[PDB]
Amino acid sequence: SVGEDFPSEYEQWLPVPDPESRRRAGVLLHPTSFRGPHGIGDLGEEAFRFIDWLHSTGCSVWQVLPLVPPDEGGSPYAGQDANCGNTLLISLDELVKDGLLIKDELPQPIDADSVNYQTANKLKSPLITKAAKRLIDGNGELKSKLLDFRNDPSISCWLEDAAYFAAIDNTLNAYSWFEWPEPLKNRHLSALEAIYESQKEFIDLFIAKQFLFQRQWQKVREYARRQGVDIMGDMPIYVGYHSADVWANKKHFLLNKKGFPLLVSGVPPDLFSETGQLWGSPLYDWKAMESDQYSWWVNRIRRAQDLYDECRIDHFRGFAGFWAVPSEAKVAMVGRWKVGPGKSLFDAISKGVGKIKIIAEDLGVITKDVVELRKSIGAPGMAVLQFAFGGGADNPHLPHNHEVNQVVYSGTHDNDTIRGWWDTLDQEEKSKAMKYLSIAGEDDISWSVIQAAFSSTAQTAIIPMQDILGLGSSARMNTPATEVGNWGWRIPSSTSFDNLETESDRLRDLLSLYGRL
Amino acid sequence: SVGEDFPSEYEQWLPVPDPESRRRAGVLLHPTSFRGPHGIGDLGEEAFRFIDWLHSTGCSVWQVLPLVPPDEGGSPYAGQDANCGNTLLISLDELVKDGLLIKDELPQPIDADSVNYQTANKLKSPLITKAAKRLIDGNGELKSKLLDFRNDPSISCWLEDAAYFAAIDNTLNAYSWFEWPEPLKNRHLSALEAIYESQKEFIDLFIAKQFLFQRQWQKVREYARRQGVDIMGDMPIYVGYHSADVWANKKHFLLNKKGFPLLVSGVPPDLFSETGQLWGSPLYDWKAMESDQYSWWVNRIRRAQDLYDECRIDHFRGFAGFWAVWKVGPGKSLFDAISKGVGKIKIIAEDLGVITKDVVELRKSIGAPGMAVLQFAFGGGADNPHLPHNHEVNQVVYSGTHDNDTIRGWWDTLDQEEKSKAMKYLSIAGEDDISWSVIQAAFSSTAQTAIIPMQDILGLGSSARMNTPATEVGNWGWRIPSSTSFDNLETESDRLRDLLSLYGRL
Numbered sequence A: 001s002v003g004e005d006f007p008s009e010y011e012q013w014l015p016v017p018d019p020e021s022r023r024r025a026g027v028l029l030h031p032t033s034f035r036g037p038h039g040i041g042d043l044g045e046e047a048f049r050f051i052d053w054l055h056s057t058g059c060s061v062w063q064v065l066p067l068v069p070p071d072e073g074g075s076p077y078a079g080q081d082a083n084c085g086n087t088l089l090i091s092l093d094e095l096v097k098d099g100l101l102i103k104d105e106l107p108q109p110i111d112a113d114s115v116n117y118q119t120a121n122k123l124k125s126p127l128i129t130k131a132a133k134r135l136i137d138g139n140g141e142l143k144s145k146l147l148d149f150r151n152d153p154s155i156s157c158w159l160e161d162a163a164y165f166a167a168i169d170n171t172l173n174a175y176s177w178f179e180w181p182e183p184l185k186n187r188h189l190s191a192l193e194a195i196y197e198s199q200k201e202f203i204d205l206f207i208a209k210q211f212l213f214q215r216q217w218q219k220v221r222e223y224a225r226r227q228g229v230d231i232m233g234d235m236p237i238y239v240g241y242h243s244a245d246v247w248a249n250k251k252h253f254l255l256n257k258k259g260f261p262l263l264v265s266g267v268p269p270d271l272f273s274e275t276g277q278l279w280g281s282p283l284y285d286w287k288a289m290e291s292d293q294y295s296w297w298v299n300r301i302r303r304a305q306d307l308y309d310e311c312r313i314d315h316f317r318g319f320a321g322f323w324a325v326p327s328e329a330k331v332a333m334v335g336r337w338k339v340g341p342g343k344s345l346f347d348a349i350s351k352g353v354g355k356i357k358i359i360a361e362d363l364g365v366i367t368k369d370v371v372e373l374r375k376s377i378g379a380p381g382m383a384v385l386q387f388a389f390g391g392g393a394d395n396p397h398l399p400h401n402h403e404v405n406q407v408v409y410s411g412t413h414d415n416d417t418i419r420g421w422w423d424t425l426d427q428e429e430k431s432k433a434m435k436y437l438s439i440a441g442e443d444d445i446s447w448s449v450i451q452a453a454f455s456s457t458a459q460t461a462i463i464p465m466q467d468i469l470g471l472g473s474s475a476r477m478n479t480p481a482t483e484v485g486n487w488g489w490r491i492p493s494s495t496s497f498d499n500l501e502t503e504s505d506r507l508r509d510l511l512s513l514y515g516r517l
Numbered sequence B: 001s002v003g004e005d006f007p008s009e010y011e012q013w014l015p016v017p018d019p020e021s022r023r024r025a026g027v028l029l030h031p032t033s034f035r036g037p038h039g040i041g042d043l044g045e046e047a048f049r050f051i052d053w054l055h056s057t058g059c060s061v062w063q064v065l066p067l068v069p070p071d072e073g074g075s076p077y078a079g080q081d082a083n084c085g086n087t088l089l090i091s092l093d094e095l096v097k098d099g100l101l102i103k104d105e106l107p108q109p110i111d112a113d114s115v116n117y118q119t120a121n122k123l124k125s126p127l128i129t130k131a132a133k134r135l136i137d138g139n140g141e142l143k144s145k146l147l148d149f150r151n152d153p154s155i156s157c158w159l160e161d162a163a164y165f166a167a168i169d170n171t172l173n174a175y176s177w178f179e180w181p182e183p184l185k186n187r188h189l190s191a192l193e194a195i196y197e198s199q200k201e202f203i204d205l206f207i208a209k210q211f212l213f214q215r216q217w218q219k220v221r222e223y224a225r226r227q228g229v230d231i232m233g234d235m236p237i238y239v240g241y242h243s244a245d246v247w248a249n250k251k252h253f254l255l256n257k258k259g260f261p262l263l264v265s266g267v268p269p270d271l272f273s274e275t276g277q278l279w280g281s282p283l284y285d286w287k288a289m290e291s292d293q294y295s296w297w298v299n300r301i302r303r304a305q306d307l308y309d310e311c312r313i314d315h316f317r318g319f320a321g322f323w324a325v326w327k328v329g330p331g332k333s334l335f336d337a338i339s340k341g342v343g344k345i346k347i348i349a350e351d352l353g354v355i356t357k358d359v360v361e362l363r364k365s366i367g368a369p370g371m372a373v374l375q376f377a378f379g380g381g382a383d384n385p386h387l388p389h390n391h392e393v394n395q396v397v398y399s400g401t402h403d404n405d406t407i408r409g410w411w412d413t414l415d416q417e418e419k420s421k422a423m424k425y426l427s428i429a430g431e432d433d434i435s436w437s438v439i440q441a442a443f444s445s446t447a448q449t450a451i452i453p454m455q456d457i458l459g460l461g462s463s464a465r466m467n468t469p470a471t472e473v474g475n476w477g478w479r480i481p482s483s484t485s486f487d488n489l490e491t492e493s494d495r496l497r498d499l500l501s502l503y504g505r506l
Ligand SMILES: C[C@H]1O[C@H](O[C@H]2[C@H](O)[C@@H](O)[C@@H](O[C@H]3[C@H](O)[C@@H](O)[C@@H](O)O[C@@H]3CO)O[C@@H]2CO)[C@H](O)[C@@H](O)[C@@H]1N[C@H]1C=C(CO)[C@@H](O[C@H]2O[C@H](CO)[C@@H](O[C@H]3O[C@H](CO)[C@@H](O[C@H]4O[C@H](CO)[C@@H](O)[C@H](O)[C@H]4O)[C@H](O)[C@H]3O)[C@H](O)[C@H]2O)[C@H](O)[C@H]1O
Pocket: A071, A073, A075, A076, A077, A078, A236, A237, A238, A267, A270, A271, A272, A277, A278, A279, A280, A281, A314, A315, A316, A317, A361, A362, A363, A364, A365, A366, A387, A390, A414, A478, A479, A480, A481, A482, A483, A484
């Protein structure tokens, strides 16, 4: 105590940085974008080569979009199921390594500069099915793992429903489950038993395909972990109407007596559309969900825990307040803001799954409740440099207004590439940006913005692969409020991870400089 | 209620920035550096002109060094008293406004490119005395304010002791109070009464001089406030042995039975000296101070409150642990006592050097901001805390302090490894404007407050350096060149304002 002598080497009693505060960087790249011969990226060789490339840069995070079966436009954010994997990500070459295909069965390569889901489906699906058929017919080690997977209660609580939904959908010629006969529509037990008898093989194959996705995704994840790379997944806030999630959990969505949505999702007039984004997903009956401690949402997060080290929460503002549009409407601009579940949801998640690493996508209309909700759960938010040059110096996306507990992006999958953005940028905004940023040639504008993200105080900086490749507007992943021509971008067939040492070295130099290695 | 509609105005329910988080900037400039004819800067017209200039830039903070009577080398950090003002900062022209001098009594101007304290003393002190004499001899409104000042208990708790110490020091031919005869050394009551009778005039004049400093300083401070400018002072953690503070409060310092120290202050081998800085000040008996709720330190802060909006604490680490030529400091117990006695304070911790865990924890526990200095940022790796990407919000960023060379001076002698680093991190145009590159980097920081020495705004070299640590001669002398007026710095003002606008510090 006060006045007395210290021990010796008091001089070596120095502050030790907290390992959870470690500065880092990463790349945003959806696996559909990998090059290869089967019309779409997959969880095979290119994923592992990408991980190796990423590791060589010093980056320690890979962010993907939702891995759910996408809508027919390719959107991960209107998925056909909330928990299933997109089976067209399954690598045929990896099935050959597993003994479920032979090399001779692999199709002839097709050129596909961009992903066409219908072309990839026709090519891959017969061989995926044939591999699943060999799996369920076999009686050894892999079959034994299939059975563990399917009897595991944290799988079967969603996978059984998904497989029955898919089987009924295969049985019926109908637009959606709204049109289904009453016993199937409302999941009468003897109807489900009848479906099990008449569709037994389809059900066993669907389940086998989910196992194969799981298996291959987990190999990619462990390989990333072996190379010092965390994977950040993405949890879309809404699911599509035509899904097992809505059909099997009707009471938990805002549907009428006949199962039709009263209200659908979106946002009011914004940057991307002067009539708003009319997403058109069904909405959650949050009060009903509260009555069984949000178990559907809890199950979702438990699933995400199993796939990802960390998870982005899409449209995070929607848990404080959400935009609700009448279901008959043709534009989002007529609508009401409604009260979200708030912290009560995250308390339920904590109680059910324990410790989670979540990233709030807090972009959009950010009201006081949104900020307070984010702070109350300790989650980092986002900054996007492409938004930084409207308004004045109080713009939160400007570097000097960044926070430590935050993730900085050059842009997301919703934004144009940096070059594309620069190219159409308003002159007032462009002249601003020239003052803040360190710009050499306009060819390398993407690198100027990348450097600005890396120089930030934000703990994590994430760059889309398109910007590392210096690509233009044609490489944009998604344009919000458009219905066609999205989610198709692929790494050009000529660009290999072997041909990107210059880019790797340049990233590593910037990470070294800004203490992100 | 979950599920319900929100009210109509929901989209406009936007976060309002917290006013206590407001980003700002300022200038470090000691008043001795102002131009003028009397051999030293003062609290007259240049201080007001500087405030007006500073306001036009968008800056909202002015940082000074300690305003105490300095040592004979000019150092504010080995002051002759912890609470008195440096009377050579008194403006003679302001005394003429007050009726205490006439214009005809003012001395002929002397050219002094730098402050010489002996030259300034010989010039100014006789007239300051003559003014103080006219004050104490007068009746009327100014005399009435002198009496209020001296009877105010938050003045007299330090000023009485300071005036008696100075009177005895004037009476005696002695090295220090250690050599004083016992009754004066040890403040025997009948000795102090005797001194009051035999030095009454000196004592009244000393007090009058402190009133005139207070008066002029408070006008400067109220003018700054009217122009939106906060003043940040500074205090050394230690005071010199030969001071009223030690002599009148012996029990509170680490002295033997005869009043001699035993333990003195400093810190080990560092950047500025391979044998360390041996400051040699006496040290606090912290346990004894705890026994009267740290009243000496509390009085000190109360005085700093009176002079400054905010205050830097030099060698803040010394409150967690101090080197005695390592011992346990008083820690948070001291700041709790300050809070209880004075209420809310705005303190800035000088947390520079090799600092230990307890220092960081202490600083965080009282909510005080620490420092980043850009001149230190380019040694070691990317974990260097002075690099912008490692700055914190609750922090004060400097290009450099009064202890560092100017940016141009620093750039000029900089090690090549460090220089090549700095070129990668900073935005540099011409080397002539290296000071502006570093100023821009400070302004772009996430740190809430950025402070730039006036020398760097003027783009000056090593000859304008204020102080070289561990040197005994040639410090504290810099003055703004006689040709540079605040009227003639519009380009510099505009450039600062453009940067503050850009980085949200207006
Ligand atoms: C996209 C993001 O939008 C919101 O934030 C925006 C904000 O609105 C902007 O103003 C701006 O804000 C910034 C300011 O501009 C700036 O000044 C400063 O202040 O900073 C602000 C940032 O804070 O930028 C932000 C961010 O981009 C949201 O708040 C934000 O959460 C959101 N991003 C994520 C959320 C979703 C929603 O799940 C994702 O949406 C995407 O997926 C949708 C669903 O697929 C898609 O909808 C389109 O496509 C549908 C088909 O898939 C289509 O559906 C119809 O047609 C189908 C057949 O064709 C049929 O089956 C359906 O039944 C039909 O309804 C929809 O009509 C169509 O809209 C979205 O377009 C797509 O973006 C995001 O990807 C997430 O990242």
